[PDB]
Symmetry: D4
């Protein structure tokens, strides 16, 4: 069916938090996005609450007209929050307290029991889990074995390719990994580093269910405003599939 767009509004809070003011408010960015092409909203509640905060999640949970996709690290604090919050989607990601952003898929194959616990735990609460991982068969077989219904392939390496050949190489690895994951019964998403200029190649991949894009959109938004930024990204996505 229709490829979907998950808009990550973390960086609205990044701008807010830089100053300690109330604006810009993620809650406003969520309404705009949801009416301009976003099929869902994503927020990464970082342990260090760098950008998205507890009030953000709490108020958003009440105001989203679509659904929340809560991104989080695998810890007891977070699992308890997710269970209490009951987001529709949950994407487990690797975290370091002071990293710039995310860059290593989640190491599922290496923490199989931790993840297995997380997946069972969140599902019991009625949350659909997605594991943020690398276009790596080892990590994918592990996500499947562990029970997760969704995986989201890290498109970072593709987005940072330094040459056209290097980019084609990564693209191919993502497409193969997508087909591979699907053959194991997993639904697959993608995201991170996706921009207005490299999104179509990823959107074209058939197995892709939803693309989670954040930074590039907010980066376009300061110039053109969120509404147009979201609608334009969505248009590019639908074009890639037609």
């Amino acid at each position: 069916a229709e490829l979907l767009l998950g808009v990550n509004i973390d960086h609205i809070a990044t701008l807010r938090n830089a100053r300690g003011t109330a604006y810009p408010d993620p809650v406003q960015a969520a309404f705009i996005a949801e009416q301009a092409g976003a099929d869902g909203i994503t927020v990464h509640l970082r342990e260090d609450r760098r950008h998205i905060t507890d009030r953000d999640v709490r108020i958003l949970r009440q105001t989203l007209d679509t659904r929340m996709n809560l991104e989080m690290a695998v810890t007891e604090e977070m699992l308890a929050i997710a269970v209490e919050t009951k987001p529709h989607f949950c994407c487990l990601v690797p975290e370091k307290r002071q990293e710039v952003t995310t860059e290593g898929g989640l190491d599922v194959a290496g923490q199989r029991d931790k993840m297995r616990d997380a997946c069972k735990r969140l599902a019991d609460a009625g949350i659909q889990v997605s594991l943020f991982i690398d276009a790596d068969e080892e990590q994918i077989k592990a996500a499947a074995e562990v029970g997760a219904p969704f995986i989201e392939i890290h498109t970072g390496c593709y987005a940072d390719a330094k040459t056209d050949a290097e980019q084609a190489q990564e693209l191919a690895r993502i497409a193969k990994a997508a087909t591979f994951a699907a053959s194991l019964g997993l639904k697959v998403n993608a995201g991170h580093g996706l921009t207005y200029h490299n999104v179509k190649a990823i959107a074209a991949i058939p197995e892709m269910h939803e693309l989670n894009i954040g930074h590039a959109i907010i980066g376009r938004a300061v110039m053109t405003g969120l509404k147009d930024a979201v609608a334009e990204m969505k248009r590019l996505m639908l074009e890639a599939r037609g």
Copy 2:
């Protein structure tokens, strides 16, 4: 004459730097702003290059169609940069390496010789100096004594007033300080924390020459886009004087 607007684009870089990507690029934000009501562009080259970087200043110096107002801490590194860069305006501000943002006027009365050196030094290079200070007579007499041709009153306390009375109190102190400074031959600017809802009271103050606003504009921009954000702030300013 006409009240002027200095748009601070630091937070365009804040968003860029959060990810290490090239966008959003301050250079684009500068063209947009300069064509939507900004009479000048301001950038704060922080020692820790948190947001605005050396390439930013170097490229902006070549692309600004109006003029640069370089905000900086008083150090030999910065003075050498300013002298080499030759910005049209220079605003000396107090810096701590890891502060959220600025909150203490510059302590001129306490470093009279340092400032006296800075002012003479920059002026020799053909730079018009402004000292970012508090609506404090002691600091103002000091700025005058030291030679600076401009001062910029810190409107932070006013912007963070917690009650209507507390706000009226601060407003009054800023207006009195503005009149006081002018009586000593200083031209006076204002800025920091200025928003769409508290700018008119400051713009109304006759002695005000230019208002330097940043965060609130970028904060509005993510929603409506820079162009409208800048034009709207400028309109509110001109309305306050008519």
Copy 3:
């Protein structure tokens, strides 16, 4: 000095409640307005929770960037809710469960004790109280005697005049009542029934502090969108003072 605009978003909620869906959400309408010329947001908590709900007030209170003006009846339930909510402003209004929409002004001259307590009570909680009253000297004197900081003159009869002469009649009545109110040291607002075609005459009255407008704005909004609706109204208001 500068005439302020208070936008009442009640009817965003009537549209929502007509169905029991979540949209259109008052919370979104607030951000749009505050960014299009509104200086404060107004919401009337009806006894029958006809439109604005407790939920709305609870979230609005945390999402507004300007300040809340809570219109309500003088009942123990509401006073308790107001004291608890701590809105910046509170406007006391007459209210019948099955009324179409506020009949006229509060009877202050006839319930000096009840009102005296309501005021003091709210004032103790840090709320600036406005008594919605008719352009009647007896009521104004009463309001002043009771200790309210503000009054809001009812513009309903003016908006309902069936002839140019009847309208002019009401106009002068409001204009005199306003000068009178001010002479007793009361700040004075006005509202109810103001439209894009009759606001300027009211806006031109010097003594007016803030105009509270809702229905006509939402009515323009379903055609043009809330943003231009709010901006147009504000524009018209400022021209009248010009």
Copy 4:
């Protein structure tokens, strides 16, 4: 040819009637919709004239540039009005005087004679009849037998689905029902509860002739303006079919 959009403007009037003012006028909204993607305009003349009025239907009938689709209960009052008004389309729904909105499908199977004479009478007047019903084979077979050329499948349950699973089930139920209705020679529409986020899966169903949508469009319009609200909906609809 292409999927048609019937825009129900009932809620423009609920906004009007909430106050008794003349605005917003349904007549205006009609021109905007017809020029923004509406192929027809829909109005439900309720027993209690809650929103649309005899006045509205009387003027719309003379101003609509496309065609009127009159929704109404099967009562002598409505049939008489229908026969006299001669709208292009008439949609027969079940109605309780004080319901929030239409609840379910018309009970056709269990009221064959009532409906058989209703369709016949309206047809003698040259009106094309559509019976609003549940995605129910029994109700569908009956609709055909009583001679109606159109049926409109209630999409309400699909819209209210509490879980993705429930939703997919309702979807399948509607698609199967639509195929069955068509096999019987019926032309089929769908509507009630359709939004910007659930409209595509319904539009994708091949048998669908025209979709009738109201509340969701009006709820978007208060933010966005009716023009864009309608165009965005028509856009999503054609995309779904492409």
Copy 5:
């Protein structure tokens, strides 16, 4: 009192009647105009019904949110229609069945009895009457003597001026004539031939109450759309008064 704008939509019907179609419909044009700066809608029912028809007048009378200004010739047909329609305003003009447009200027001084009975009759029906005349003090004194509360100075000669000097002369003529009219207690309007480039000089005349403009606006409209055309005219009008 702000200068008012009366928008004549006759030429919307000129376009419609040129083909026999039902569009463009003057009824839609009226809603757009009243919401873009028009304080009133003007229509000239012509004997030959070349543009505005009885239908238009009958529907507009029910859809106008502001008020109707019916332009007509002084004949039995028209007077009976006006009394039955009961427009807020009515402007009597010279009419010749085969004319391009109004030649300009009622001969009031040469027909005091006819014009006296017309005004009385229209005023008995509660219609404020405007006598369309030339910038001639004889016609003006006559207008006052016959009982009309309004007159509208014909701006056609000013508009068709062939030299800067002739224009200046007509401008000075309209101005002095307007001051004279006001001294007689007459409210003075103006119109016919006004354009985006010659309206300011007329708007600057203090005594002017309302300007009635039509063709120029419709001619701008086919290019830029009715909304911006009305708005632009009103904007130039208000600027001239400041």
Copy 6:
């Protein structure tokens, strides 16, 4: 080959000529149209010069960026004008001095010699000739026999259809007639009476080369502006072909 759009700006002049002014100028309308989706500009020089004049034709011939399609009657006057103007295209139509608009359909089969000499003459001047005819295979066979490279099926009956059935019948008629025409080597255009709501069915006909639309577009234009009106039509046309 994409379906092309020929925009007839006759009615821009209808509005101009109604007053004698110089605006709105067909010349400006042509630039807007050619840049908003029009692949060619069409003008019908009428014997009574009711709208387009010799001036228009003479200036348009020098300002058109695409190409002119001159609609005219088959008379000596016109043929001489066309040969002198040398329009890229020329469409011959039935003409009666006092007609509302083109009645529809050249009698080619009843005047083979006249039409044969006309085509030759225009083709000698290098003008590609289009014979405006009815969806009649006799007229079509004749058109081919006389030597015309183009014909334009008259869509007026389809447009004025009074019932869904009559419309369908005319649609099927235009379609089969177009297939027949193409089999004779004729390029087939269509136009007259097409609107935003009936253009798709005609655009979907594969054999169609260019559609010539005028009035509907000008009627939309007075409301929304020429640009969006042309664009909207072209958009619906291309969607129909997909």
Copy 7:
């Protein structure tokens, strides 16, 4: 009355001529400017037809809705063209065949007879003459003596000011010159080098009748579009006078 804006569209043509294509057409730009704040259109027919052509002047003369202001050198070629073209205004400038742009003012004082006969000849043709000169009392006195009704002060040096001090000096020089010219009965315009950032101080000068601006407006238009470019300039101009 109000400050007038003459928009010079020469550089629309430099873009055209750089390629020999027909676009962009000056004729189109003229309609856009005249409807966006231009009170007149200016063209400089250069000796080398670098941008504007005889063709342009010939068509503009027939399409301009306002008036043409022909800029040209004082040569037999240009005077003859001027006399024949009959533009409303003619501005006499100094010109070298291969200059980048006009360098300074016309040498009037030192060529009295040449200019005296030029003004006389153009005046016999009914053209209003303006002599482009430096803010020079000698050149100004001479301009008056040779009979020119207008002078246009070169704002070039003010525009090129290398320092704020230099700029203020030039400003003062122009304002004083303007006052002097007026005392001599001359009407005075100004232009060349005016931008969005230096236009206000010039517009503020009371004696200024019309400002002629070109390059700056066209430079903004390639980014922004001509419409907004012209409207923004007219906006800044009226603000300066208010």
Copy 8:
């Protein structure tokens, strides 16, 4: 697969250089385009630095977000500049100092040695080389033999065709040349003379990788603004492939 758009901003600079001011600045034009549908920016460094300057290339290289396509002559100066600049793409073009704008295609078949070296040289520097050539098999074979990755077919003759037949002639010639080029393993682009009215036929050619367009876009831009100019072109291109 997905046709790419390369926007040539040369003529932004011609407009700038016509005066020697800093605006319009190519650097601003780049950001706008890259964000409106351009996939890469093209600039031609002329020997005479007619428009694009070394400054432009130096900054552009650091500000572009997509990638540079440097068009240049095959000279030691340019090769040195290219190797030093390291543009993503480089297109070799024939160039005469006083030419109006690139005459035709490079002569590769006649200078196989020179080109062989240029290619290898640039390739060693990491640049993908495109040989701008005529749709001539001899040249294509040559280009393939020499080792260039790409060729860019000259669309000038196609754009200049004076008859529909001549245009069609050129079309097929380009289409065959493209299939031919591809069969030799060459990637193929096209450009020069493409406009909004002739791009689709070229865009529809399967083998096309990227179309490089400049002048027509800047020409549309002075009217509508660069953003809509770029977007429109891209939109048209994508529809042709659709």
